[PDB]
Amino acid sequence: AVPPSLRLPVIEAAFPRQLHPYWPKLQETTRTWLLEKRLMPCYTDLMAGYYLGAPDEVLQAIADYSAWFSVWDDRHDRDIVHGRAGAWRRLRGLLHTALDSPGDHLHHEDTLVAGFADSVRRLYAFLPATWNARFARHFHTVIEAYDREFHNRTRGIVPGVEEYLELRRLTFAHWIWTDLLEPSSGCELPDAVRKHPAYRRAALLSQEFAAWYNDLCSLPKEIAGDEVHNLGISLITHHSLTLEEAIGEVRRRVEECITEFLAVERDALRFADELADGTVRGKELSGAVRANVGNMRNWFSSVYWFHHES
């Protein structure tokens, strides 16, 4: 049930889908939140196949943040095609402020900002302040990355290949989704653990696959819409690739993500085994790493099948 150019047999054979038991209540509860926040007149299935093991309240807050994220991206796109640079700048500034102090913005006149503030307020309630500050530091970067995308897209500038890859780690919010692994498994990871090279590399590859596979699926539509910002378009524009050639290159980069992930997933799980040193704290850290890496794995199949279902 998958067009041959988009089919990844290793995902189909070796990454069995998982579904969180709270999924049936997720979409309606998110709809109710969007309605209460006046953010509409779904990515919830995507999240339910990703953050396995999350407490119901954690998954619900992630789903609401994820849905808020979809509304912000629609607004961003509309400001882009209407060239509303003043409106975008003001939103960009309000989101930076609301991120650091959400409580002051819970009833802001801009419903997108008030909804962001409540979403982030709820995410800040699961782990210690040090995790909250990490999330904020990471999302400040996402906001500025969205600003560089506004710059490129309003001016019709196609970024270079590495320039796009570096930017897309930020607009896709790679490190936000990675941060959210930790409230899902109930444990803030020490820097020495989450900065372990196997943990970092596993987390990166999971996110690269998701962002690059999205670009692969959307490439034909986006070149026909004269878009910029897609890995295939940077390759066409800057490496003189034809469309078929760019589809083949993105596809190979996507396939290699998988097998590179399988190798580093072994290293991350060995590390998880090393953390279980016979102490209670070590067992806790080991289970958290193993749960987090398992969800890094779940991202692959959740994203793959989401594209073909939605």
Curated annotation (Swiss-Prot):
Annotated residues that bind Mg(2+) 1 are located at D73, D77
Q: What class of enzyme is it?
A: lyase
Q: In which pathway does it act?
A: Sesquiterpene biosynthesis; epi-isozizaene biosynthesis
Q: Where is this motif: DDXXD motif?
A: 73-77
Cofactor binding note:
Binds 3 Mg(2+) ions per subunit. Can also use Mn(2+) and Fe(3+) but less efficiently, and other divalent cations such as Zn(2+), Fe(2+), Co(2+), Cu(2+) and Ni(2+) are nearly completely inefficient as cofactors.
> Does the keyword section mention Repeat?
no
Please identify the protein, giving its name as recorded. Epi-isozizaene synthase
Q: What is the lineage of its organism?
A: Bacteria, Bacillati, Actinomycetota, Actinomycetes, Kitasatosporales
